[PDB]
Amino acid sequence: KKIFKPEELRQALMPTLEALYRQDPESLPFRQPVDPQLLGIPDYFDIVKNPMDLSTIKRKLDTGQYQEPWQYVDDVWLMFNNAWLYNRKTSRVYKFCSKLAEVFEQEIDPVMQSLG
């Protein structure tokens, strides 16, 4: 069972996260946590039980919170699935989510092969 050093796991996975952040405009609604109070959407946490966003993923990747690569992958998919569950299919958020998911799959596949 391969053990992962925290800084090596971060270096391996960081380019996949940077690829998401580089999408403009598609990363913009994902760069900060959904704040239902600021946005006036009190139903949000009734639907999204486990919020996730790029800034939280980055913080976790920077602070040794992912012991194995699949935990990072799970958080990326959680972010996407939250947005695809809460938002209209033709909404900006949903369409932007789909672009990020396209980019992510391209980026994570060879990385996971090299890790393993």
Q: What is the DSSP annotation of 37-104?
A: HHHT-TTHHHH-SS---HHHHHHHHHTT--SSHHHHHHHHHHHHHHHHHHS-TTSHHHHHHHHHHHHH
Name the residue nearer to ligand F31 (CB basis): 34 or 108.
34
Minimum Å gap between C-beta 91 and ligand F31 is 8
* Residue closest to ligand F31 (Cβ): 29
d(CA 48, CA 52): 9
Name the residue nearer to ligand F31 (CB basis): 30 or 66.
30
Which spans of this chain sit near ligand F31 (rule: CB under 6 A)?
29-30, 34, 39, 41, 83, 86-87, 93
Name the residue nearer to ligand F31 (CB basis): 93 or 103.
93
